[PDB]
Design a binder for this molecule. Structure first.
Ligand SMILES: [Ca+2]
Length: 133
């Protein structure tokens, strides 16, 4: 488990972190219900000649971390190795839709969720994680 203020981090192993839902959800959990709630993984940085892949999962913040795995796949970041005429590195972002996922895991009443990042290959830095509309 990693605190939100621990980012930026090097994703050398599987990590999880508690991510707050958007502020409007605090007063009314159905605020902005016809808009997609989006998980944003910011400041993804790596050398372009290194293949990168990490997978993203979400679980209910109230689950026991010492208990069985209840994580739900949300998406993946993939980069294929390449060269670039004036950049050694790429600095990018990943956005994943959460609205259906939160309904499926039955966490739509919660104010935060747990986001797990699972590195598969490649050295990569993660700048930050947030949820917004
Ligand atoms: Ca819950």
């Amino acid at each position: 488990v990693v605190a939100g203020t621990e980012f930026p981090i090097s994703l050398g192993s599987k990590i999880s972190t508690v991510v707050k839902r958007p502020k409007q959800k605090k007063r009314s959990k159905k605020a902005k219900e016809d808009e997609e709630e989006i998980l944003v993984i910011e400041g993804i940085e790596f050398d372009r000649d290194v293949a990168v892949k990490f997978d993203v999962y979400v679980n209910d913040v109230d689950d026991l971390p010492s208990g069985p795995d209840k994580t739900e796949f949300a998406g993946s970041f993939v980069s294929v190795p390449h060269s670039h005429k004036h950049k050694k590195k790429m600095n990018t972002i990943l956005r994943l839709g959460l609205t259906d996922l939160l309904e499926e895991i039955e966490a739509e009443d919660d104010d935060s969720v747990v986001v797990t990042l699972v590195p598969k290959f490649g050295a990569v830095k993660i700048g930050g994680i947030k949820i917004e509309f």
